[PDB]
Amino acid sequence: APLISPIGHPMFSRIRLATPSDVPFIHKLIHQMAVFERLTHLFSATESGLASTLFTSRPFQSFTVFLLEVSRSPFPATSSPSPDFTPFFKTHNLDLPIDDPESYNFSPDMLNDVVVAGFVLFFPNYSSFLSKPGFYIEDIFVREPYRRKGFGSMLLTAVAKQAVKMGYGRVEWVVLDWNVNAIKFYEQMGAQILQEWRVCRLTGDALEAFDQVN
Amino acid sequence: APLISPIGHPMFSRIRLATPSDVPFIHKLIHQMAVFERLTHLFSATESGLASTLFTSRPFQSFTVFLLEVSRSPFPATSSPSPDFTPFFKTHNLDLPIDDPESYNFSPDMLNDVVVAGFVLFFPNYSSFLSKPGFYIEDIFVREPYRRKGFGSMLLTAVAKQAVKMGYGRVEWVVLDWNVNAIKFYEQMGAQILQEWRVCRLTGDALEAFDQVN
Numbered sequence: 294a295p296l297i298s299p300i301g302h303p304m305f306s307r308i309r310l311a312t313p314s315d316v317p318f319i320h321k322l323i324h325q326m327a328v329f330e331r332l333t334h335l336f337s338a339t340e341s342g343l344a345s346t347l348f349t350s351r352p353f354q355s356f357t358v359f360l361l362e363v364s365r366s367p368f369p370a371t372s373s374p375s376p377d378f379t380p381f382f383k384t385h386n387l388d389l390p391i392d393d394p395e396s397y398n399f400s401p402d403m404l405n406d407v408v409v410a411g412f413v414l415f416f417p418n419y420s421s422f423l424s425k426p427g428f429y430i431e432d433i434f435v436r437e438p439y440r441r442k443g444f445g446s447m448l449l450t451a452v453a454k455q456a457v458k459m460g461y462g463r464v465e466w467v468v469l470d471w472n473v474n475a476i477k478f479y480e481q482m483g484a485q486i487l488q489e490w491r492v493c494r495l496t497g498d499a500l501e502a503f504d505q506v507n
Numbered sequence: 508a509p510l511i512s513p514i515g516h517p518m519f520s521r522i523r524l525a526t527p528s529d530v531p532f533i534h535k536l537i538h539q540m541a542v543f544e545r546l547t548h549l550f551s552a553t554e555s556g557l558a559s560t561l562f563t564s565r566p567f568q569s570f571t572v573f574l575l576e577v578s579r580s581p582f583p584a585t586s587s588p589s590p591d592f593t594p595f596f597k598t599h600n601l602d603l604p605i606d607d608p609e610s611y612n613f614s615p616d617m618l619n620d621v622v623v624a625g626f627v628l629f630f631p632n633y634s635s636f637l638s639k640p641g642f643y644i645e646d647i648f649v650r651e652p653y654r655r656k657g658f659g660s661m662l663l664t665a666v667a668k669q670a671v672k673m674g675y676g677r678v679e680w681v682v683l684d685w686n687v688n689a690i691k692f693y694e695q696m697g698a699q700i701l702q703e704w705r706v707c708r709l710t711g712d713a714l715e716a717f718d719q720v721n
Contacts, residue, residue, distance in 0.1 A: 320638075323635045332636060338638035342637075342638030346640055349568070350564065354563070354568075355568060356633050414633060414635060417569060418645060421646050422546060423556075424552035424556030425560060431633055431635065450717060454717050454718070456714065463710040463714065465706060465707065465708050467705065467706055470704070476705075482709070482713065483714075485708050486705050487708060489684050490681045490684070490706045491702070492681055492704045493693050493698045493700055494698060494701060495679075495697065496641075496676060503670075504668070504671045
């Protein structure tokens with residue numbers, strides 16, 4: 294195909310490990326996710342809480358976050374937070390340029406046009422039958438100006454590739470039963486929906502009541 | 508109530524942290540769980556695999572197992588594996604004595620009549636909206652001679668009490684949608700079933716295929 298001209302409106306992406314410096318961006322992404330999911334009454338996250346709880350172990354040992362950053366220019370390629378990870382890169386052909394007015398709140402530096410567009414939070418789970426760890430994806434969120442461009446699936450693929458690299462047995466996550474388009478995409482990549490399983494949660498006053506029963 | 512005589516057929520229980528010495532008992536409990544759940548083709552766990560993967564972090568930092576032991580005599584009350592845990596004890600009034608022919612395979616010592624009857628495997632999960640860890644229960648299993656006596660709920664309550672002690676935000680687990688009796692018991696204790704959620708799993712050849720896509 295004789296294509297000389299570069300793509301119109303290219304967008305460069307990088308998926309990297311979050312470090313403590315990224316706490317304000319993680320906090321703001323979670324707040325936007327609460328607004329998006331209509332679960333704002335549950336939002337009580339703080340920067341101090343995220344800083345205090347997300348980095349008590351090494352990357353991939355417990356809570357791990359990958360951040361997705363985007364730029365209108367290639368990323369110029371500090372030691373990585375883990376010896377077991379190197380960032381992923383991809384070039385995207387956008388149909389139209391992206392309008393992102395909140396980019397000032399999601400810019401680690403800003404002088405290089407690097408904007409945090411989304412995240413995935415995950416941690417090791419376990420398969421008793423295989424005697425092997427796996428990864429469980431707790432949350433994937435992409436900010437509204439970047440949705441419907443394949444970025445959420447790239448964050449999922451980053452976790453799946455990390456599991457294979459580490460010799461892990463499974464990658465698990467939840468899908469909303471009415472999100473028919475996501476279900477079909479997951480079935481297309483070979484994932485199985487565990488039809489019989491229902492998730493139970495004990496929290497708030499109901500969880501607090503266990504302090505008394507002996 | 509003028510009750511002088513001790514209960515007929517008392518059974519004493521203790522819930523404690525599993526240590527590396529318990530690996531053969533964990534392996535045998537998982538094998539019985541595979542037979543019980545009719546998922547024996549998936550069973551490939553080994554003692555070396557469990558030893559290699561379950562103790563790479565401190566208790567409660569990642570994969571944690573509580574074991575349930577039972578005895579026809581009280582437990583006589585070695586330093587605990589964690590500074591954050593002390594074993595739980597309970598006295599049970601059994602209607603009839605228990606027949607457990609496999610007790611020789613589940614006896615850490617045997618000279619004190621201490622038999623491993625079940626386990627719970629769990630690990631920290633996370634609530635982004637609270638910026639707080641929680642616990643996710645991966646598996647609870649009670650061996651057949653000890654079922655229908657409240658031991659499974661005691662293992663669940665052990666995890667819930669550990670979450671409260673640590674200041675954690677949630678305790679989560681899965682129930683089979685047709686296990687109507689368990690669902691009603693969970694609703695009675697204040698747990699909520701997350702009706703919309705479906706669990707997806709990527710494993711085997713489908714997971715291995717992510718090694719190639721770049």
